[PDB]
């Protein structure tokens, strides 16, 4: 399960209400150190697609920590997810089989529903954890992308849709980074 909201669409009819308290103490056991080829090749067409001329050294030192934030935070939204009660909209699921419909079937529907689910739990603990992108971020990481990069972004400095739409971008990996840091994790090599 590859759970890692925003590609297609950035309140939502679903809800997702909160049951038990969520237990920080609780140690996620993490059942794989590696990915399987085709992860790693998707993201490495996504890393050279935006750096054309990105080096090896470089490509490793990306790839690496797409693994592994992947495993961690794939495992502990997996405990997450136990503490919640959630009604999922009708057609709101239908929607978001959408955008992922144009990038067999009842996996879309599998998919869209952890989407979904993600998405309420991020907003939720946003409040407890407190946590913010500000425009000056924003601004920055547009800045850094021209410099590597050489591509106009300047559609996306001055036009609310689309500067609005980094934020969310680097919120989401903020709360990943974030659902990480709260937790102990072990690793199942062995045993449990």
Same mark, same amino acid.
């Given at each position: 399960d590859y759970d890692i909201f925003q590609g297609h669409m950035a309140n939502l009819k679903s809800t997702a209400k909160l049951v038990k308290p969520i237990q920080y103490d609780e140690v996620i056991e993490v059942e794989r150190i590696f990915a399987d080829p085709a992860f790693i090749e998707q993201h490495r067409q996504r890393i050279l697609a935006s750096f *054309?001329?990105? *080096?090896e050294s470089a490509l490793y030192h990306e790839l690496t920590h797409i693994v592994i934030k992947d495993n961690l935070f794939s495992c502990a939204m997996n405990a997450i997810v136990g503490y919640f009660e959630f009604n999922i909209d009708e057609a709101e699921l239908k929607n978001v089989m959408e955008g992922l419909k144009r990038d067999e079937d009842n996996t879309v529907q599998a998919i869209a529903e952890k989407i979904i689910k993600k998405a309420l739990v991020f907003n939720h603990l946003q409040k407890e954890w407190k946590v913010e992108i500000t425009d000056e971020v924003v601004k920055n990481v547009i800045s850094l992308y021209y410099e590597k990069t050489n591509q106009s972004v300047r559609e996306y400095l001055d036009d609310k849709q689309k500067f609005e739409g980094v934020r969310t971008a680097l919120l989401e990996e903020r709360m990943v980074l974030e659902t990480i840091n709260h937790f102990k994790f072990h690793f199942n090599l062995t045993g449990q």
């Open positions: *054309k001329d990105a *080096k």
